[PDB]
Ligand binder design. Structure first.
Ligand code: 7KW
Length: 257
């Protein structure tokens, strides 16, 4: 896993944020990679590399894979280069806006599959949203930034607090489980079918929290099949035990058409 820095050549900066940068580069001369680097002092090396350790423990076709790390400063985590970057950005592009509902739900099904593996293995995501899904040249989706002890912000490694994906039990008591991820996934489905639109459009974060106290749920988005809306509503059941498993979500999305 540890590799010498000279095995890597960083070519182009993909983003810069509060805690570091992400670069496209090449590994061993030919393998196109993305390189996340830690801005010194943001957090400790061990806190940063925790993401890498989690990638090792959970390997799956729908999960971002660890290629290597560089443990001397600047610290690097290295993965496969994904041509289309973050799902939330890709959905807003010319190509993303033209995707059919069939293709959007195939992508949703891939995300549910990855989440079904995380559930099966008794882990949680905690940061599940379109921003933390990566998309390949063939439109295959991979889950990033899973299993962390901490809640991340989207401006840490690119230019841009997130509560619009957080289940009520997590807001009120800090209770995070796979069922709070199921909640987050329902919100992610709204991102998918609205070509990347922000949830709860024209509410601020405090207004969302006030509305959730009163049991508020988003209406059916314009581009949204009724059956897909009823799946979102199941994701957003107040009691976590009433929310479906990821196993179930995967099966319904895979067989949707
Ligand atoms: C624009 C166009 C393409 C890409 N490609 C890409 N490919 C793989 C990963 C990433 C990326 C974006 N944010 N964080 C990462 C990331 C980088 C290394 C390890 C773990 C996550 N990013 C990113 C931005």
């Amino acid at each position: 896993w540890e590799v010498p820095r000279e095995t890597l050549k960083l070519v182009e900066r993909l983003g810069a944020g509060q805690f570091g940068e992400v670069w496209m580069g090449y590994y061993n001369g030919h393998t196109k990679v993305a390189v996340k680097s830690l801005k010194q002092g943001s957090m400790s090396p061990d806190a940063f590399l925790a993401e890498a350790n989690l990638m090792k423990q959970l390997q799956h076709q729908r999960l971002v894979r660890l290629y290597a790390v560089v443990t001397q400063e600047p610290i690097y985590i290295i993965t496969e280069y994904m041509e289309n970057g973050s799902l939330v950005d890709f959905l807003k592009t010319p190509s993303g806006i033209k995707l059919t509902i069939n293709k959007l739900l195939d992508m949703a099904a891939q995300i549910a599959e990855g989440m079904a593996f995380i559930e099966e293995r008794n882990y949680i995501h905690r940061n599940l949203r379109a921003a933390n899904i990566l998309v390949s040249d063939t439109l295959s989706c991979k889950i990033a930034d899973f299993g962390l002890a901490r809640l991340i912000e989207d401006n840490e490694y690119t230019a841009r607090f997130p509560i619009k994906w957080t289940a009520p039990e997590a807001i009120n008591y800090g209770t995070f489980t796979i069922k709070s991820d199921v909640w987050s996934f329902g919100i992610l489905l709204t991102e998918i079918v609205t070509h990347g639109r922000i949830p709860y459009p024209g509410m601020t974060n405090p207004e969302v929290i006030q509305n959730l106290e009163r049991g508020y749920r988003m209406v059916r988005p314009d581009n949204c099949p009724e059956e897909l809306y009823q799946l979102m509503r199941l994701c957003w059941k107040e009691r976590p035990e009433d929310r479906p498993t990821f196993d179930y979500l995967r099966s319904v999305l895979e067989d949707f058409f």
